[PDB]
Amino acid sequence: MTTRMYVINTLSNMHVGSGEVNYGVIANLIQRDSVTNLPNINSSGLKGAIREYFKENEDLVRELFGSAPRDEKTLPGKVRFFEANLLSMPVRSDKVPFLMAISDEVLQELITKMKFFNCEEATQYISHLSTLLDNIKTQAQGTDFAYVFDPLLQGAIIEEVSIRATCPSHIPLQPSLKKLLGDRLVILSHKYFSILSDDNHLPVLSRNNLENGQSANLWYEQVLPRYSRLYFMLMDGNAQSEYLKKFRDTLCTPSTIIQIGANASIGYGYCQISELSPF
Amino acid sequence: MKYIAITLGPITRTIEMAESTKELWAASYFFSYLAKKIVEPFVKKNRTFQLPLINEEMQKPHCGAGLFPDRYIFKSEPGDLELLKQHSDQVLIEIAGHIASPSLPGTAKDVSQIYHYLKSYIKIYFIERTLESDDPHVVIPACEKYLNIIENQETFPEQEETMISHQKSDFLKFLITNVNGKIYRKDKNSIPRFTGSFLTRDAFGDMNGERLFESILEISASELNINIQQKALEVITANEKYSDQIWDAEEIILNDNKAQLRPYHKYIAIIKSDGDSMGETIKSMGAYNIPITQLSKALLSFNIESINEIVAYGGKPIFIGGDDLLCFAPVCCNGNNVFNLVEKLSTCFDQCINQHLQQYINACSEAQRPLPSLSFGISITYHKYPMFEALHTTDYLLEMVAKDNLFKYTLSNKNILNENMKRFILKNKLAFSLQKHSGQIYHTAMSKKGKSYVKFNMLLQKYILKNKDQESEKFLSSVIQMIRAHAEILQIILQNEDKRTEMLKNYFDNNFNESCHLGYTGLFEDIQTLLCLRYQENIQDYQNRNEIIQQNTILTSDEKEILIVSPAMDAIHTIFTALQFIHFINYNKD
Amino acid sequence: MKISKKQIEYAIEALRANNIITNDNQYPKVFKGYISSFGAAVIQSGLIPAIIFFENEDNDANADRHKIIGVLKDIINAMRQQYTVTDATILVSSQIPANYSMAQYIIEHGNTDQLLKEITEAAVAMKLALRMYKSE
Amino acid sequence: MNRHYLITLTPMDWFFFGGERTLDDGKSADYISHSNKFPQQSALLGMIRYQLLKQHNLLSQFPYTENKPTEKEIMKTLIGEQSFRMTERKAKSLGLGVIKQISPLMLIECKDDTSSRSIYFPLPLDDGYKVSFNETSNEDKVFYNGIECPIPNVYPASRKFFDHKTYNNYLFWCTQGNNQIKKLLSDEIWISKMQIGITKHVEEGEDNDKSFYKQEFLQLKKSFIYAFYITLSGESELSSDIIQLGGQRSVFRMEVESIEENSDIQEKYQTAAQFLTQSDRLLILSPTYVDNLKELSALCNFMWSDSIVFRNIQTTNASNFYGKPIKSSSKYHFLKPGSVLYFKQGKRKEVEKLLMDYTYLRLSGYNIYI
Numbered sequence A: 001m002t003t004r005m006y007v008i009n010t011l012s013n014m015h016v017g018s019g020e021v022n023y024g025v026i027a028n029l030i031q032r033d034s035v036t037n038l039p040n041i042n043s044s045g046l047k048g049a050i051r052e053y054f055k056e057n058e059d060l061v062r063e064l065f066g067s068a069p070r071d072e073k074t075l076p077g078k079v080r081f082f083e084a085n086l087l088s089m090p091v092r093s094d095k096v097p098f099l100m101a102i103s104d105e106v107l108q109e110l111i112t113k114m115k116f117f118n119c120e121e122a123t124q125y126i127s128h129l130s131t132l133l134d135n136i137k138t139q140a141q142g143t144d145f146a147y148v149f150d151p152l153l154q155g156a157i158i159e160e161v162s163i164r165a166t167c168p169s170h171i172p173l174q175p176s177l178k179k180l181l182g183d184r185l186v187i188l189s190h191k192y193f194s195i196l197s198d199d200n201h202l203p204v205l206s207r208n209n210l211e212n213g214q215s216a217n218l219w220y221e222q223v224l225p226r227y228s229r230l231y232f233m234l235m236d237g238n239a240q241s242e243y244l245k246k247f248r249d250t251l252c253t254p255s256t257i258i259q260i261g262a263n264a265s266i267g268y269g270y271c272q273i274s275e276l277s278p279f
Numbered sequence B: 001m002k003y004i005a006i007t008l009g010p011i012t013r014t015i016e017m018a019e020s021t022k023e024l025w026a027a028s029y030f031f032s033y034l035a036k037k038i039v040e041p042f043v044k045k046n047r048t049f050q051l052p053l054i055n056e057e058m059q060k061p062h063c064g065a066g067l068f069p070d071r072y073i074f075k076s077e078p079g080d081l082e083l084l085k086q087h088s089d090q091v092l093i094e095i096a097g098h099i100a101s102p103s104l105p106g107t108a109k110d111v112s113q114i115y116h117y118l119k120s121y122i123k124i125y126f127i128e129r130t131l132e133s134d135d136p137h138v139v140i141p142a143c144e145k146y147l148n149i150i151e152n153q154e155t156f157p158e159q160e161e162t163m164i165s166h167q168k169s170d171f172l173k174f175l176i177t178n179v180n181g182k183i184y185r186k187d188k189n190s191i192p193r194f195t196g197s198f199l200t201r202d203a204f205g206d207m208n209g210e211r212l213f214e215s216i217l218e219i220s221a222s223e224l225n226i227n228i229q230q231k232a233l234e235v236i237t238a239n240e241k242y243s244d245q246i247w248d249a250e251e252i253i254l255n256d257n258k259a260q261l262r263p264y265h266k267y268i269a270i271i272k273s274d275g276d277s278m279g280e281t282i283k284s285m286g287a288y289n290i291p292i293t294q295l296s297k298a299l300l301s302f303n304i305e306s307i308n309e310i311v312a313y314g315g316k317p318i319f320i321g322g323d324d325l326l327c328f329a330p331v332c333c334n335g336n337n338v339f340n341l342v343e344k345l346s347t348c349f350d351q352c353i354n355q356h357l358q359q360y361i362n363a364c365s366e367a368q369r370p371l372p373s374l375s376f377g378i379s380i381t382y383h384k385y386p387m388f389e390a391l392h393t394t395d396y397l398l399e400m401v402a403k404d405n406l407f408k409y410t411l412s413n414k415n416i417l418n419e420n421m422k423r424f425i426l427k428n429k430l431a432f433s434l435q436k437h438s439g440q441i442y443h444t445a446m447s448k449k450g451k452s453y454v455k456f457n458m459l460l461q462k463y464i465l466k467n468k469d470q471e472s473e474k475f476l477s478s479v480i481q482m483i484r485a486h487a488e489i490l491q492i493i494l495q496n497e498d499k500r501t502e503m504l505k506n507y508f509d510n511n512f513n514e515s516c517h518l519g520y521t522g523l524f525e526d527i528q529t530l531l532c533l534r535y536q537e538n539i540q541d542y543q544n545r546n547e548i549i550q551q552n553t554i555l556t557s558d559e560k561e562i563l564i565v566s567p568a569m570d571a572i573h574t575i576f577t578a579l580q581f582i583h584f585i586n587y588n589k590d
Numbered sequence C: 001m002k003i004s005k006k007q008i009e010y011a012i013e014a015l016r017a018n019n020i021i022t023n024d025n026q027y028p029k030v031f032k033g034y035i036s037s038f039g040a041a042v043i044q045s046g047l048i049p050a051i052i053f054f055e056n057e058d059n060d061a062n063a064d065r066h067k068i069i070g071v072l073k074d075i076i077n078a079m080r081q082q083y084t085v086t087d088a089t090i091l092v093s094s095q096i097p098a099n100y101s102m103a104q105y106i107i108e109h110g111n112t113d114q115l116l117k118e119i120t121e122a123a124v125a126m127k128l129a130l131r132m133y134k135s136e
Numbered sequence D: 001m002n003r004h005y006l007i008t009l010t011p012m013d014w015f016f017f018g019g020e021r022t023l024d025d026g027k028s029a030d031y032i033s034h035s036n037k038f039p040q041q042s043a044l045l046g047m048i049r050y051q052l053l054k055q056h057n058l059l060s061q062f063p064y065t066e067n068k069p070t071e072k073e074i075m076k077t078l079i080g081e082q083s084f085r086m087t088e089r090k091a092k093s094l095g096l097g098v099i100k101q102i103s104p105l106m107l108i109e110c111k112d113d114t115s116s117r118s119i120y121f122p123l124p125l126d127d128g129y130k131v132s133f134n135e136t137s138n139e140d141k142v143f144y145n146g147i148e149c150p151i152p153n154v155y156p157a158s159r160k161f162f163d164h165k166t167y168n169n170y171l172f173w174c175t176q177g178n179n180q181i182k183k184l185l186s187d188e189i190w191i192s193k194m195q196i197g198i199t200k201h202v203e204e205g206e207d208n209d210k211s212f213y214k215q216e217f218l219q220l221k222k223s224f225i226y227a228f229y230i231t232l233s234g235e236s237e238l239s240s241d242i243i244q245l246g247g248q249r250s251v252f253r254m255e256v257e258s259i260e261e262n263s264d265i266q267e268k269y270q271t272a273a274q275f276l277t278q279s280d281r282l283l284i285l286s287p288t289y290v291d292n293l294k295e296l297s298a299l300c301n302f303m304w305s306d307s308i309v310f311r312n313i314q315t316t317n318a319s320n321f322y323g324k325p326i327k328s329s330s331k332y333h334f335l336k337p338g339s340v341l342y343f344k345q346g347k348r349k350e351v352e353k354l355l356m357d358y359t360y361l362r363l364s365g366y367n368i369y370i
């Protein structure tokens, strides 16, 4: 009945359009945070996607998300949606197809956000993540780092930024932290993550428009890689317990897939919303 | 002696109040009308004017453009103060009456309420200084600074009731919104006409050709000899305020003319120009003994010739007064481009400066001092793109880039302007931006001082297709992507001082080494020459500026990188933007 | 990929240093074909056979084909000079000795994935930098 | 009996404060919606009333009701019977319930050494310049729309004259330092982003392709928070919670801190503003309203001022609350904070009497000067 953390875990490519005026080759760019330039989803897009999924359940939509745009009478929604910040991203590797890349700065920002928002299971996650971050800083000692926690993953190569994965044996990764951040997790410096998540390294796809075999238009598209993880905060205010429980159970159902992003018909931005499990 | 200086009008706010081209024109001409009516008694009483040269020609209607500025310095005999006060009150009472209930779409109006609103809104401040010298060079800046400080006193209406229609209090936007009047019908087989307000009948005259402006498409697309406004008016009046309906109908009518429709017909260009350091020019004409009346003559002649050129090209003059110009013109019509119009305007300004300021031109020639010049800001946008955003973009271009006010503003906010840094202020620039319907935005800046501008204009003239008539020069679109992709290599080539031209020619020959490219040697040579000229001008203008900016310790790294411009990359971007504009004009989705 | 300006600069300096371009910005015509064929040979055959074929002196060719291998070695040396020396990095920054044939270096310095990537990038840089000059 | 609190608002996300919504009226909306840097005092008062009605669980939920007239009476004596309107701008009492006095909203900087707070005010429009108003008489007289005024001779306090090409006081905010006045740019305080929004076209219905808009969202710098002072009468508890302030469901966090008793919040605000005092002029600290600007202009030689727009959402104690709210039929213009009034010789008390004649606005947080 308070602020809750949700994880997105996109199962496909995701393209949430900024609508910004492009200065380069990529016509369609993805939404990025103003301050940190990390990929993000606007709260309006999150609310739109979740309302689209639940649109059939009219009472739940009216109670939680509010009235329709054409409704003759307006009811404010009881649920407040926040921005979805990038948690982890898949990066190309050599021993494995990919690794889930996280940075120290995004971990610190997540800790600050949970402290500021006071999530449901905030305390244990804050304590364990703070201990992990302090151990990481103790082992790094001001140097650029890339730490794997699976012993088999030692010596892994991040392809885009040519760095090698080290294994600190005295830094334990708790199972809940693995469930939150992902499997085959790599913790590296935020400079490496910023380079990996910048415009020159995010996947760019060429697209065509053909009329009777003649190309009408050409443009390039930017997408967020599949299996990337994003987190947002949901504030319910104080909604009906039955509608809120229905919303949480439907969201956490393994068979529930939410479409966030532009290209729905060609399978862009299908995700599985998770809840912060108790530690 | 007994000089009088008059400043009037919250021009920026009223221009902000317009969301359409016709509303912008009405707002701009409202203040010209006010100034004309305010100053016509003093001109009729034949007193010497030290600022604006008010002759018979400026009082005549000139294609619906406002030639009357907002600042007037005026020599007054005793008895002009209360005369000016009473005339200001009377010219508020009139106009308040003129907006009461002519053939204007509305319900009813209270003359006293309109007069109160106009008095609370329209700024009318005048200063009667007692100076000791009759020299214009002394009286003009001394009164100008006091006018500048006078402009900071704010007067506004306290209450604005706008609801239940018939008790309105915002009448200026009623005037600008309803300036074409109410479209009136009197027959089943005739041409519907606009019952224009007092502004239209004072601006556009009353002698035929009375197609008053309505929606931007008619000048956005005026080369097809299609009376789009007549068809739009007949379509609107065939069924059943009206600005949106006319805009939609005009768009549809332009859509059924796909046969001879080119993509630039839906794009509109905004032109803004200001005088490059007119105050320092006046100081120079104070040092060398040249009267300022010659400068006023040159400015008035340039204004008249610029109005004529804008009308001949096919655009619309919004405001041309003093050193300031605002024009709405088609991107390309009847074979001429926007940049052709800009070149013509620059040529007209130079011709008027030479004709009316020959003594000062000769003095500054051997003295090695800069001459008066025009900085230009051009914005081309989709017709549906917000006009406020387009005007803000044009202002940003002109002021910040073309007048180099980014450098000066960043330096002054940190209080490091000094004088050696002031030596690096660059004028005589052309800022141009084209934003597509998808927001691709091509922007560049160029210096009109050297031959790079001439070569740019010649390239545009050469490689832009003319309408079907005998052959053109066969522009090649593959060079656009080559320059973008090979930009760093071109920078490396440009940085080689001894073998720059040979390396550029060799690179273009070796990349475009196929049989088809034998017909594009002229294009390759032209772009090579333009690139070399632009790089030379850029290094001359910006090298020492970049070194001193980097050597500065106060400025932050981000502000340093914003202020620092790379000469080679800037030249490459200019070539890229020129080629993109050529391709945009040339290509049509058949 | 995208064109690397620093590698183009290294290619220019190595082409000048290995006596490919004369005092005038001109080179013998066959070197264009040499540079273009080197990458295709590297892909189709192995890296070692291609380096052996192009590094081979006393061959019957219209010009000095081993000069391109010299240019490649110089570019690789410049790249390794510019490499960042940090822990948890993959690249080895030791320069290739001037008394060493490239074939011998690749022979006794195996696991040559980094060397393969460097050689391909240097070949691309050589191809793109040779276009600034004219063929006699 | 009269407890005074200090309320600090921390922006938990991007916030949006509504503007005029239009440069005209009728049915038109604004494609570009811009965000005011500050909320109206009406927004603060309504937030206080809503939070009080949340603490004492008396809320207007689901369609419409009449609210049990005994509950109507208790809600009247709690929050008043009426919203903020400028019709009662000369009333000697706020007319609300337990709410008595609200200070103008302050920009407070919180440092790492969280023991002291820095209060930031807009830079006075005359800062760094000297204005003289030479009175040798018969020299030169300004006529501001036909009223006599002495000529405003102005010089930088460092001669030359006012160069409006270098005038930039309107871009700066200021705070007290143990030396000179610290100038902070508005850019360094507020971060602004423009968001594009559409309604997804659900077919088999709607003519709504027309749903397309841009909005401006403002974010405060990490060390900056909003704050104001409130006086609550008798038995009235204000608990820290999560509140709504501004459009688009902008969310904030209250910290309710009870300062020592027998304190005057007006005196606290004026003590904060003391460092900007100049004896030859009046500095407008909060949006000031005068019914007629003519008398004010007659009372001073120069009005280096600007104007802001005001329009309140007017709701009765028992209103619909689910529908288009009724807004003040009249759009009102206030004097922008940081404006300076250079009065004539003497007559400072006359201008002060004119300004404090509207005690209702003074209690709310408007018409405050130093």
Ligand SMILES: Nc1ncnc2c1ncn2[C@@H]1O[C@H](COP(=O)(O)OP(=O)(O)OP(=O)(O)O)[C@@H](O)[C@H]1O
Pocket (backbone or CB within 6 Å): B051, B052, B053, B140, B144, B274, B275, B276, B277, B278, B279, B280, B282, B292, B295, B296, B299, B300, B321, B322, B323, B403
């Ligand atoms: N008709 C005119 N005759 C003489 N001077 C004029 C005339 N119109 C305007 N001026 C001069 O224009 C000056 C104001 O110019 P403005 O502020 O537009 O910019 P500028 O000095 O031309 O250049 P910039 O914008 O680069 O600073 C005044 O000092 C005034 O003397």
Ligand SMILES: C[S@@+](CC[C@H](N)C(=O)[O-])C[C@H]1O[C@@H](n2cnc3c(N)ncnc32)[C@H](O)[C@@H]1O
Pocket (backbone or CB within 6 Å): B007, B008, B009, B010, B011, B012, B027, B028, B029, B031, B032, B066, B068, B069, B070, B151, B319, B321, B324, B325
């Ligand atoms: C930005 S305003 C500043 C002062 C303002 N003109 C006033 O009197 O309050 C100055 C600019 O307004 C423009 N301008 C002046 N008179 C105008 C008019 N009648 N119509 C349109 N623009 C005008 C010119 O570009 C001039 O340089």
Ligand SMILES: [Mn+2]
Pocket (backbone or CB within 6 Å): B274, B275, B322, B323, B324
């Ligand atoms: Mn000007």
